[PDB]
Design a protein around this ligand. Structure first.
Ligand SMILES: NC(=O)[C@H]1CCC(=O)N(Cc2ccc3cc[nH]c3c2)C1
Ligand SMILES: NC(=O)[C@H]1CCC(=O)N(Cc2ccc3cc[nH]c3c2)C1
Ligand SMILES: [Zn+2]
Length: 139
């Protein structure tokens, strides 16, 4: 679990969105595993606007933060799960690191701010849904 709170927006993994997220829906993209909902209270998380390929992510299944080198956002095949059939997930970045399904929502940050959230993993990999291209989150 986990979310990004920026301005009047809440960014979550689409597969973990709640009834309240869907009732206040702003945008969603199944191919990216992202959903953004509106909030009444202002958030002050900062989104990175950069091309960093290193950062640190929070891993809830270890209660620890880990440094990572990750790939640029790209279209990657993701095997079927109980939430999606087998498909290409877009805007996904991979890195070597520990992740389990419940780690989804952990934030990846660089020195500029929030880069994305954990969305995939397995066998010593961790995949993050990028949010740096969503410029409208800042307005
Ligand atoms: N026309 C309708 O039936 C909609 C209109 C807008 C609307 O908020 N709902 C209720 C609702 C809310 C969240 C969720 C998640 C899943 N289903 C939901 C249903 C019903
Ligand atoms: N973005 C997706 O399509 C997700 C949807 C929810 C989901 O359970 N998965 C499989 C998955 C996710 C993380 C991990 C870490 C280790 N094994 C994992 C297996 C894929
Ligand atoms: Zn950066």
């Amino acid at each position: 679990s986990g979310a990004i709170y920026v301005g009047n927006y809440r960014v979550v993994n689409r597969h973990l969105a709640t009834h309240n997220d869907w009732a206040n829906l702003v945008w969603e993209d199944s191919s990216r595993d992202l959903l953004v909902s509106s909030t009444t209270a202002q958030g002050c998380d900062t989104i990175a606007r950069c091309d960093c390929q290193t950062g640190v992510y929070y891993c809830s299944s270890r209660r620890k933060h880990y440094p990572v080198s990750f790939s640029k956002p790209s279209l990657i095949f993701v095997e079927a799960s109980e939430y999606y059939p087998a498909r290409y997930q877009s805007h996904l970045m991979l890195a070597v690191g520990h992740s389990e399904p419940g780690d989804c929502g952990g934030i990846l940050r660089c020195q500029h701010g929030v880069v994305g959230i954990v969305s995939t993993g397995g066998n010593g990999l961790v995949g993050f849904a990028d949010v740096r291209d969503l410029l409208w989150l800042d307005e």
